[PDB]
Design a protein around this ligand. Structure first.
Ligand code: NU9
Ligand code: K
Ligand code: K
Ligand code: ZN
Ligand code: ZN
Length: 368
């Protein structure tokens, strides 16, 4: 296998859809990964990468993060809740195809894991997983927010249990808080979880991920929530996220010094997502640049896994810029006006809260 960027995609994951067939009512649709996959070929990036199909996660791999009851319910064939539209699901948003959802969720978990091992073993330089359904909301014993199994958390656990990576950084720049990922690794100091999300004092899904939530026991200080407050006005975009990377994400990541970086790469903070889905204005160039910054860690061992993002144009633009970054294309910070603007007052106050809390744990957060 050649030493380039890896891409994960398979049609099995397209099968996850409600029986009613309305992709408008169920916005986490197959078109999401389908559009990105073809977009990468149209732009010429896909042929440059080593394209893999992935695999099903074993029941044992799913149980490394989730409970036995959870894995029996969503992981196995029955032969071994009603919705307004008529289909079955765990809740109104999180649908369940009785023939295909389990297989698609297990494939997303297995494929992110398979890609992480190849990047960890250094067969691949880095990778991008075009997977669905998403994972970072799925906790130990709860499927929620379009998520069933936490693919990124499962990939992380398997890397540790097979001794392929000592320290692992999980970065989650999806606009929503990865409640599942935070819970899984809350007491583990060998995993560092840094989330950037719209918090607005608990009035935004899932409602968790406050700045005070720093971890527990041995894992105290190794959970970093960059919880944005203040609202949508003034606009949250590139200057705020760039500032977040300069001041919080990269300094803590460098002080932690991971052996492998996993990215819950949601693109619902991008332009084209109105409230209450996101309401943020992060450009595609910023996503690709944030990717480029993470490639400086762990000797380039970086793996992105798709999470959220609805607007087809926005997530395709952003996915393109991240894959290009992975392939070695560099973004010149001086080439874009607007990046010269300072971050807004709401973002500064939010980062002030992050610094004040984590000054107890990190040297780069300790000031006079
Ligand atoms: O508030 C939410 N959604 C808003 C609505 C939308 N959800 C999406 C959507 C599209 C693709 C993936 C996930 C959500 C578009 S609109 C829900 C019903 O229709 C009107 C607003 C909501 C609630 C729970 C979870 C999420 C959510 N978004 O991304 C993710 C993911 F897990 F990161 F993928 N989860 C979003
Ligand atoms: K997040
Ligand atoms: K942690
Ligand atoms: Zn339906
Ligand atoms: Zn999201």
């Amino acid at each position: 296998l050649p030493f380039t960027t890896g891409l994960i995609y398979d049609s099995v994951m397209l099968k996850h859809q409600c029986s009613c067939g309305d992709n408008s009512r169920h916005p986490e649709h197959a078109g999401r990964i389908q559009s990105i996959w073809s977009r990468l070929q149209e732009r010429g990036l896909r042929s440059q990468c080593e394209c893999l199909r992935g695999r099903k996660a074993s029941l044992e791999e799913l149980q490394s993060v989730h409970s036995e009851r959870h894995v029996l319910l969503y992981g196995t064939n029955p032969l071994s809740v009603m919705l307004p539209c008529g289909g079955v699901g765990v809740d109104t948003d999180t649908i369940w195809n009785e023939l295909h959802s389990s297989n698609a969720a297990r494939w997303a978990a297995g494929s992110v894991t398979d890609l992480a091992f190849k990047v960890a073993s250094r067969e691949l330089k880095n990778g991008f997983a075009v997977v669905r359904p998403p994972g970072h909301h799925a906790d130990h014993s709860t499927a929620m927010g379009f998520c069933f199994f936490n693919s990124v958390a499962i990939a992380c656990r398997q890397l540790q249990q097979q001794s392929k990576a000592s320290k692992i950084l999980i970065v989650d720049w999806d606009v929503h808080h990865g409640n599942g990922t935070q819970q899984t690794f809350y007491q583990d100091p060998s995993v560092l979880y840094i989330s950037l999300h719209r918090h607005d004092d608990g009035n935004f899904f899932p409602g968790s991920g406050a700045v005070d939530e720093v971890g527990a026991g041995s894992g105290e200080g190794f959970n970093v929530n960059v919880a944005w407050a203040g609202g949508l006005d003034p606009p949250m975009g590139d200057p705020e996220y760039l500032a977040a990377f300069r001041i919080v994400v990269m300094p803590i990541a460098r002080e932690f010094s991971p052996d492998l970086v996993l990215v819950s790469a949601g693109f619902d903070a991008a332009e084209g997502h109105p409230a209450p889905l996101g309401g943020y204005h992060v450009s595609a160039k910023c996503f690709g640049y944030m990717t480029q910054q993470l490639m400086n860690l762990a000797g380039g061992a970086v793996v992105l896994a798709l999470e959220g993002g609805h607007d087809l144009t926005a997530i395709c633009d952003a996915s393109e810029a991240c894959v290009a970054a992975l392939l070695g294309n560099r973004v010149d910070p001086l080439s874009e006006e607007g990046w010269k603007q300072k971050p807004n007052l709401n973002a500064i106050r939010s980062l002030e809260a992050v610094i004040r809390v984590h000054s107890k744990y990190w040297g780069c957060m300790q000031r006079l």
